[PDB]
Amino acid sequence: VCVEVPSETEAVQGNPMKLRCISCMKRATTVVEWFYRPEGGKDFLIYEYRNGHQEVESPFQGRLQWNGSKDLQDVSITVLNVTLNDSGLYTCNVSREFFVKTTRLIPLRVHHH
């Protein structure tokens, strides 16, 4: 069955990081938006599912990898090759029609070694 599990919030520099986002659903059109915000900055979109997985232009374009389910209850993504600079707040927005909308916040912090 579908369990809602929070994402890890600590990442090791140089490894891939899974930004977990799970929205267990009510027995359906889906939109998923992933946002990132650097310390002292503004949210910008980095990943989108909106009638398909869209190419989103961002500093993240190139290092993102989809890691979710086909049923779209798991909408996790992976950031490849993590740097100290990827620290910040990641937001996962999942909306569902035929209405719902759920938000998940990931205060991501990257470490050495």
Numbering used by the authors: 1 to 27, 32 to 102, 110 to 124
What does the published report state?
The vertebrate Nav channel is composed of an ∼250-kDa α subunit, which contains the ion-selective pore, together with ∼40-kDa β subunits that modulate the voltage sensitivity, gating kinetics, and trafficking of the channel. The Nav β subunits (β1 to β4) are related to the L1 family of cell adhesion molecules and are thought to possess a single extracellular V-type Ig domain, connected via a stalk to an α-helical transmembrane domain and an intracellular carboxyl-terminal region (4–6). The Ig domain contacts the Nav α subunit and modulates its gating properties. Here, we report the crystal structure of the human β3 subunit immunoglobulin (Ig) domain, a functionally important component of Nav channels in neurons and cardiomyocytes.
